[PDB]
Amino acid sequence: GSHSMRYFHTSVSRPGRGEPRFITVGYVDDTLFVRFDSDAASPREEPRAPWIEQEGPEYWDRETQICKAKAQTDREDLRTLLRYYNQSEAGSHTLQNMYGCDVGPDGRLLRGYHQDAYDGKDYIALNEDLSSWTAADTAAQITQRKWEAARVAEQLRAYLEGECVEWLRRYLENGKETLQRADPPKTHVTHHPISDHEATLRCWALGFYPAEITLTWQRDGEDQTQDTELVETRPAGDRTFQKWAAVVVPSGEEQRYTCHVQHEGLPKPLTLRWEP
């Protein structure tokens, strides 16, 4: 199937409590494989998946230098952004950055990404053409013209079309035991009486990978969209994910209702009922 690689970065200033905290993590699909935390004792980038441990020491040296350099540029950018927004040096502010690439089943680039947010709001984003920018406001237009003058997008494009895709393909081969295995969900329906006239039907999906999944309740074959409670897909802690969908049904109506499960790890979309 299609695959993705993403690097996420957060810097959070804390005036009066030292320099900004910097945390960055790398993902392939929904699998964490590297992390770096500026508040660790001897901060280095560390493996978080078995198939990245085989990379040699100079891979880890270069990766650590890049994280440290990024930590420094975020600190300068946070001070810069205080000026751009006429803000006091007394508050805590947040800088977020994400970049990465998507590849299709044949391993060619589907699209690349590079975007930033300030205080949780979009700031500047590389467009899908990998050559122009979208700035969210007039402060971000300042950055956009600095970045156009330095030709940042040309270097990002070379990276996103070159090493991003090439190293993602390498990671996918080395971790193919896990990265190229879909784990289907274990599914069942539970029943929880509410009152004499109502009960909850809860449709479960457990232990699945990757996180993408669809759970729908139908009543007489029609989607119960507006009346279904759908919790966010959540991590089990062991690489897999969980989700449930629930619906409140009049007692004695239970068999009008069907739960529908689609997951890439399932040959056919499943259909489940409750049975006492």
Partner: peptide
């Protein structure tokens, strides 16, 4: 494999 400008400032 991470990217770095081979500096980019906001």
């Amino acid at each position: 494999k991470r990217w770095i400008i081979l500096i980019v400032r906001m």
